[PDB]
Design a protein around this motif. Structure first.
Motif, PDB file in Angstrom:
ATOM      1  N   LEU A  95     -28.398  -3.727  -9.793  1.00 29.39           N
ATOM      2  CA  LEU A  95     -27.176  -4.059 -10.516  1.00 29.39           C
ATOM      3  C   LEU A  95     -26.862  -3.081 -11.640  1.00 29.39           C
ATOM      4  O   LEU A  95     -25.697  -2.673 -11.820  1.00 29.39           O
ATOM      5  CB  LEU A  95     -27.368  -5.478 -11.014  1.00 29.39           C
ATOM      6  CG  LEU A  95     -26.189  -6.016 -11.830  1.00 29.39           C
ATOM      7  CD1 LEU A  95     -24.848  -6.083 -10.990  1.00 29.39           C
ATOM      8  CD2 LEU A  95     -26.507  -7.373 -12.452  1.00 29.39           C
TER       9      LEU A  95
ATOM     10  N   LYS B 141     -30.345  -3.324 -19.893  1.00 27.12           N
ATOM     11  CA  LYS B 141     -31.803  -3.375 -20.107  1.00 27.12           C
ATOM     12  C   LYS B 141     -32.057  -2.620 -21.404  1.00 27.12           C
ATOM     13  O   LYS B 141     -31.694  -1.455 -21.491  1.00 27.12           O
ATOM     14  CB  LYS B 141     -32.512  -2.759 -18.898  1.00 27.12           C
ATOM     15  CG  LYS B 141     -34.042  -2.695 -18.925  1.00 27.12           C
ATOM     16  CD  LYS B 141     -34.539  -1.951 -17.656  1.00 27.12           C
ATOM     17  CE  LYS B 141     -36.040  -1.543 -17.713  1.00 27.12           C
ATOM     18  NZ  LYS B 141     -36.489  -0.755 -16.495  1.00 27.12           N
TER      19      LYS B 141
ATOM     20  N   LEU C 288     -23.851  -5.762 -19.942  1.00 22.78           N
ATOM     21  CA  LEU C 288     -25.157  -6.247 -19.490  1.00 22.78           C
ATOM     22  C   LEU C 288     -26.056  -5.047 -19.514  1.00 22.78           C
ATOM     23  O   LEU C 288     -25.701  -3.982 -18.924  1.00 22.78           O
ATOM     24  CB  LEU C 288     -25.049  -6.844 -18.067  1.00 22.78           C
ATOM     25  CG  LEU C 288     -26.372  -7.342 -17.506  1.00 22.78           C
ATOM     26  CD1 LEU C 288     -26.835  -8.596 -18.243  1.00 22.78           C
ATOM     27  CD2 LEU C 288     -26.066  -7.732 -16.042  1.00 22.78           C
TER      28      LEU C 288
ATOM     29  N   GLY D  96     -36.941  -2.993 -22.529  1.00 18.81           N
ATOM     30  CA  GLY D  96     -36.970  -3.396 -21.049  1.00 18.81           C
ATOM     31  C   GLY D  96     -36.464  -4.816 -20.836  1.00 18.81           C
ATOM     32  O   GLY D  96     -36.587  -5.416 -19.756  1.00 18.81           O
ATOM     33  N   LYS D  97     -35.901  -5.358 -21.906  1.00 19.45           N
ATOM     34  CA  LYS D  97     -35.311  -6.721 -21.884  1.00 19.45           C
ATOM     35  C   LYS D  97     -33.893  -6.774 -21.322  1.00 19.45           C
ATOM     36  O   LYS D  97     -33.097  -5.897 -21.598  1.00 19.45           O
ATOM     37  CB  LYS D  97     -35.298  -7.244 -23.309  1.00 19.45           C
ATOM     38  CG  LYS D  97     -36.698  -7.207 -23.896  1.00 19.45           C
ATOM     39  CD  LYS D  97     -36.927  -8.276 -24.887  1.00 19.45           C
ATOM     40  CE  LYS D  97     -38.441  -8.436 -25.106  1.00 19.45           C
ATOM     41  NZ  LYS D  97     -38.652  -9.172 -26.363  1.00 19.45           N
ATOM     42  N   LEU D  98     -33.527  -7.872 -20.681  1.00 17.65           N
ATOM     43  CA  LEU D  98     -32.145  -7.999 -20.218  1.00 17.65           C
ATOM     44  C   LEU D  98     -31.270  -8.775 -21.208  1.00 17.65           C
ATOM     45  O   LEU D  98     -31.667  -9.809 -21.710  1.00 17.65           O
ATOM     46  CB  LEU D  98     -32.144  -8.719 -18.882  1.00 17.65           C
ATOM     47  CG  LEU D  98     -30.900  -8.768 -18.046  1.00 17.65           C
ATOM     48  CD1 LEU D  98     -30.462  -7.352 -17.569  1.00 17.65           C
ATOM     49  CD2 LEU D  98     -31.160  -9.721 -16.869  1.00 17.65           C
TER      50      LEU D  98
ATOM     51  N   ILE E  34     -22.236 -11.960  -3.825  1.00 17.07           N
ATOM     52  CA  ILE E  34     -23.539 -11.350  -4.013  1.00 17.07           C
ATOM     53  C   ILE E  34     -24.646 -12.399  -4.026  1.00 17.07           C
ATOM     54  O   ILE E  34     -25.680 -12.226  -3.392  1.00 17.07           O
ATOM     55  CB  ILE E  34     -23.597 -10.498  -5.308  1.00 17.07           C
ATOM     56  CG1 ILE E  34     -22.585  -9.338  -5.186  1.00 17.07           C
ATOM     57  CG2 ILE E  34     -25.048  -9.969  -5.513  1.00 17.07           C
ATOM     58  CD1 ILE E  34     -22.482  -8.514  -6.463  1.00 17.07           C
ATOM     59  N   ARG E  35     -24.426 -13.438  -4.829  1.00 16.86           N
ATOM     60  CA  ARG E  35     -25.343 -14.577  -5.091  1.00 16.86           C
ATOM     61  C   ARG E  35     -26.585 -14.217  -5.915  1.00 16.86           C
ATOM     62  O   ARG E  35     -26.875 -14.891  -6.924  1.00 16.86           O
ATOM     63  CB  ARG E  35     -25.821 -15.231  -3.762  1.00 16.86           C
ATOM     64  CG  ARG E  35     -24.788 -15.986  -3.038  1.00 16.86           C
ATOM     65  CD  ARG E  35     -25.616 -16.786  -2.054  1.00 16.86           C
ATOM     66  NE  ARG E  35     -24.976 -17.992  -1.738  1.00 16.86           N
ATOM     67  CZ  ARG E  35     -25.461 -18.905  -0.922  1.00 16.86           C
ATOM     68  NH1 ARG E  35     -26.659 -18.756  -0.344  1.00 16.86           N
ATOM     69  NH2 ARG E  35     -24.725 -19.981  -0.716  1.00 16.86           N
ATOM     70  N   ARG E  36     -27.326 -13.197  -5.478  1.00 18.98           N
ATOM     71  CA  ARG E  36     -28.624 -12.847  -6.084  1.00 18.98           C
ATOM     72  C   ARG E  36     -28.823 -11.339  -5.955  1.00 18.98           C
ATOM     73  O   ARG E  36     -28.488 -10.783  -4.870  1.00 18.98           O
ATOM     74  CB  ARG E  36     -29.779 -13.611  -5.387  1.00 18.98           C
ATOM     75  CG  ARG E  36     -31.159 -13.133  -5.827  1.00 18.98           C
ATOM     76  CD  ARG E  36     -32.238 -13.807  -4.960  1.00 18.98           C
ATOM     77  NE  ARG E  36     -32.218 -15.220  -5.121  1.00 18.98           N
ATOM     78  CZ  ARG E  36     -33.023 -15.865  -5.965  1.00 18.98           C
ATOM     79  NH1 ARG E  36     -33.815 -15.197  -6.821  1.00 18.98           N
ATOM     80  NH2 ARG E  36     -32.966 -17.168  -6.015  1.00 18.98           N
ATOM     81  N   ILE E  37     -29.302 -10.685  -7.027  1.00 17.92           N
ATOM     82  CA  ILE E  37     -29.456  -9.257  -6.998  1.00 17.92           C
ATOM     83  C   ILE E  37     -30.505  -8.864  -7.984  1.00 17.92           C
ATOM     84  O   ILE E  37     -30.747  -9.609  -8.944  1.00 17.92           O
ATOM     85  CB  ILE E  37     -28.135  -8.540  -7.365  1.00 17.92           C
ATOM     86  CG1 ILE E  37     -28.114  -7.034  -6.959  1.00 17.92           C
ATOM     87  CG2 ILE E  37     -27.775  -8.784  -8.837  1.00 17.92           C
ATOM     88  CD1 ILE E  37     -26.673  -6.418  -7.083  1.00 17.92           C
ATOM     89  N   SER E  38     -31.187  -7.749  -7.738  1.00 19.93           N
ATOM     90  CA  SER E  38     -32.138  -7.202  -8.733  1.00 19.93           C
ATOM     91  C   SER E  38     -31.449  -6.519  -9.868  1.00 19.93           C
ATOM     92  O   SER E  38     -30.369  -5.959  -9.692  1.00 19.93           O
ATOM     93  CB  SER E  38     -33.122  -6.251  -8.058  1.00 19.93           C
ATOM     94  OG  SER E  38     -32.459  -5.072  -7.671  1.00 19.93           O
ATOM     95  N   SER E  39     -32.036  -6.591 -11.060  1.00 20.58           N
ATOM     96  CA  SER E  39     -31.465  -5.832 -12.155  1.00 20.58           C
ATOM     97  C   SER E  39     -31.469  -4.319 -11.866  1.00 20.58           C
ATOM     98  O   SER E  39     -30.596  -3.579 -12.368  1.00 20.58           O
ATOM     99  CB  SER E  39     -32.181  -6.110 -13.479  1.00 20.58           C
ATOM    100  OG  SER E  39     -33.542  -5.755 -13.402  1.00 20.58           O
TER     101      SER E  39
ATOM    102  N   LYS F  36     -27.228  -0.067 -17.673  1.00 23.25           N
ATOM    103  CA  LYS F  36     -26.036  -0.584 -18.326  1.00 23.25           C
ATOM    104  C   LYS F  36     -24.955  -0.880 -17.305  1.00 23.25           C
ATOM    105  O   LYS F  36     -24.759  -0.122 -16.377  1.00 23.25           O
ATOM    106  CB  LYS F  36     -25.453   0.438 -19.298  1.00 23.25           C
ATOM    107  CG  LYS F  36     -26.392   0.694 -20.468  1.00 23.25           C
ATOM    108  CD  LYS F  36     -25.815   1.628 -21.528  1.00 23.25           C
ATOM    109  CE  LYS F  36     -25.827   3.131 -21.052  1.00 23.25           C
ATOM    110  NZ  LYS F  36     -27.178   3.612 -20.501  1.00 23.25           N
ATOM    111  N   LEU F  37     -24.251  -1.978 -17.533  1.00 25.07           N
ATOM    112  CA  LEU F  37     -23.085  -2.299 -16.755  1.00 25.07           C
ATOM    113  C   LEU F  37     -22.021  -2.995 -17.603  1.00 25.07           C
ATOM    114  O   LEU F  37     -22.315  -4.025 -18.263  1.00 25.07           O
ATOM    115  CB  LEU F  37     -23.441  -3.204 -15.572  1.00 25.07           C
ATOM    116  CG  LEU F  37     -22.315  -3.690 -14.641  1.00 25.07           C
ATOM    117  CD1 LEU F  37     -21.636  -2.452 -13.932  1.00 25.07           C
ATOM    118  CD2 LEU F  37     -22.856  -4.708 -13.658  1.00 25.07           C
TER     119      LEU F  37
END
Lengths: 40, 42
Positions: free
Chosen positions: B12, B32, B30, B36-38, B4-9, B18-19
């Motif tokens: 994701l 939000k 993981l 609205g914080k990660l 993937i390398r890079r992805i938007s929250s 939630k993930l």
């Protein structure tokens, strides 16, 4: 329930995923001690 | 296919924000937060 994904799917061989969130980068990584760690 | 390398929250985490990430059988979450914080927790 909350979906599940393997850290392997997210991290690849370099052990890092950049997550773009609210205008900045966060780094999710696997550490030498075997942990997952998110930094801002 | 590549890592993937890079992805938007947004992509994701989806609309629920939630993930669960299974790291060698140890589940991390993981998300939000409502503010609205990660955040990554276990």
């Amino acid at each position: 329930p909350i979906r599940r994904i393997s850290s392997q799917t997210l991290l690849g061989p370099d052990g890092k995923l950049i997550i773009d969130h609210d205008g900045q980068e966060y780094l999710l990584r696997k550490t030498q001690a075997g942990k997952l760690l998110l930094t801002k």
